[PDB]
Design an enzyme around this catalytic site. Sequence first.
Site, PDB file in Angstrom:
ATOM      1  N   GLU A   1      -7.540  55.272   1.389  1.00 48.08           N
ATOM      2  CA  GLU A   1      -7.795  54.382   0.172  1.00 48.08           C
ATOM      3  C   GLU A   1      -7.803  52.733   0.367  1.00 48.08           C
ATOM      4  O   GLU A   1      -8.750  52.112  -0.183  1.00 48.08           O
ATOM      5  CB  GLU A   1      -6.945  55.065  -1.063  1.00 48.08           C
ATOM      6  CG  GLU A   1      -7.791  56.087  -1.535  1.00 48.08           C
ATOM      7  CD  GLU A   1      -9.059  56.026  -2.624  1.00 48.08           C
ATOM      8  OE1 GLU A   1      -9.270  54.907  -2.767  1.00 48.08           O
ATOM      9  OE2 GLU A   1      -9.584  57.023  -3.012  1.00 48.08           O
TER      10      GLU A   1
ATOM     11  N   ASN B   1     -14.527  49.117  -9.601  1.00 48.90           N
ATOM     12  CA  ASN B   1     -15.054  50.525  -9.899  1.00 48.90           C
ATOM     13  C   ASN B   1     -16.482  50.110 -10.380  1.00 48.90           C
ATOM     14  O   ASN B   1     -16.385  49.360 -11.464  1.00 48.90           O
ATOM     15  CB  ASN B   1     -14.204  51.153 -10.748  1.00 48.90           C
ATOM     16  CG  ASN B   1     -13.153  51.727 -10.264  1.00 48.90           C
ATOM     17  OD1 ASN B   1     -13.273  52.434  -9.319  1.00 48.90           O
ATOM     18  ND2 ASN B   1     -11.838  51.320 -10.795  1.00 48.90           N
TER      19      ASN B   1
ATOM     20  N   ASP C   1     -18.145  51.293 -12.940  1.00 51.93           N
ATOM     21  CA  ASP C   1     -17.951  52.061 -14.419  1.00 51.93           C
ATOM     22  C   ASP C   1     -17.145  50.516 -14.947  1.00 51.93           C
ATOM     23  O   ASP C   1     -17.095  50.775 -16.348  1.00 51.93           O
ATOM     24  CB  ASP C   1     -17.129  53.067 -14.580  1.00 51.93           C
ATOM     25  CG  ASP C   1     -15.848  52.913 -13.972  1.00 51.93           C
ATOM     26  OD1 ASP C   1     -15.700  52.631 -12.734  1.00 51.93           O
ATOM     27  OD2 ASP C   1     -15.026  52.973 -14.784  1.00 51.93           O
TER      28      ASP C   1
ATOM     29  N   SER D   1     -14.145  49.309 -14.306  1.00 44.75           N
ATOM     30  CA  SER D   1     -12.659  49.743 -14.266  1.00 44.75           C
ATOM     31  C   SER D   1     -12.510  48.930 -12.842  1.00 44.75           C
ATOM     32  O   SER D   1     -13.284  48.571 -12.258  1.00 44.75           O
ATOM     33  CB  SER D   1     -12.335  50.743 -14.430  1.00 44.75           C
ATOM     34  OG  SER D   1     -12.685  51.850 -13.489  1.00 44.75           O
TER      35      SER D   1
ATOM     36  N   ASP E   1      -9.818  49.443  -9.258  1.00 46.04           N
ATOM     37  CA  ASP E   1      -8.859  49.966  -8.138  1.00 46.04           C
ATOM     38  C   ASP E   1      -7.610  49.001  -7.737  1.00 46.04           C
ATOM     39  O   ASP E   1      -7.870  47.967  -7.133  1.00 46.04           O
ATOM     40  CB  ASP E   1      -9.286  50.065  -6.921  1.00 46.04           C
ATOM     41  CG  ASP E   1     -10.485  51.160  -7.107  1.00 46.04           C
ATOM     42  OD1 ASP E   1     -10.507  51.915  -8.290  1.00 46.04           O
ATOM     43  OD2 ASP E   1     -11.228  51.761  -5.956  1.00 46.04           O
TER      44      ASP E   1
ATOM     45  N   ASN F   1      -6.685  53.619  -9.890  1.00 44.60           N
ATOM     46  CA  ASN F   1      -7.613  53.252 -10.835  1.00 44.60           C
ATOM     47  C   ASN F   1      -7.185  52.772 -12.220  1.00 44.60           C
ATOM     48  O   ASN F   1      -6.454  53.455 -13.026  1.00 44.60           O
ATOM     49  CB  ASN F   1      -9.038  54.167 -11.084  1.00 44.60           C
ATOM     50  CG  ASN F   1      -9.987  53.521 -11.884  1.00 44.60           C
ATOM     51  OD1 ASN F   1     -10.192  52.563 -12.196  1.00 44.60           O
ATOM     52  ND2 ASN F   1     -10.709  54.824 -12.236  1.00 44.60           N
TER      53      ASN F   1
END
Length: 129
Positions: free
Chosen positions: A35, A46, A48, A50, A52, A59
């Site tokens: 990750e 992100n 959408d 949002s 990380d 998230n």
Amino acid sequence: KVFGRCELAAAMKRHGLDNYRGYSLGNWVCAAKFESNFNTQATNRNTDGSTDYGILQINSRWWCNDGRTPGSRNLCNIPCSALLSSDITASVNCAKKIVSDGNGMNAWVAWRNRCKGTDVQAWIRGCRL
């Protein structure tokens, strides 16, 4: 903080990640490797809207408060930037929780298809715990 192989694994063990929700430590090392590639400052957009956060790439969408996302949950009751810190305890301490809903380590995309069905002990092999 640039985490070594030998450094991050050892800490996740002390951090009480060892075989948490049964998941062997070698997963946890690998997911940190997949990750963020052992980065704790690493944060990513992100799509959408949002973000990380954390070495665990946890998230911000509903876990944390990042001060930019309308519709965010904050269950962790911690600011997002506490996920980027050189002490492993804040990212790990919300990773247990991400597993504490009982929805698995399947909240992570990397451990999802990239880190399953693989030798689990190979990360940890040759480092002491």
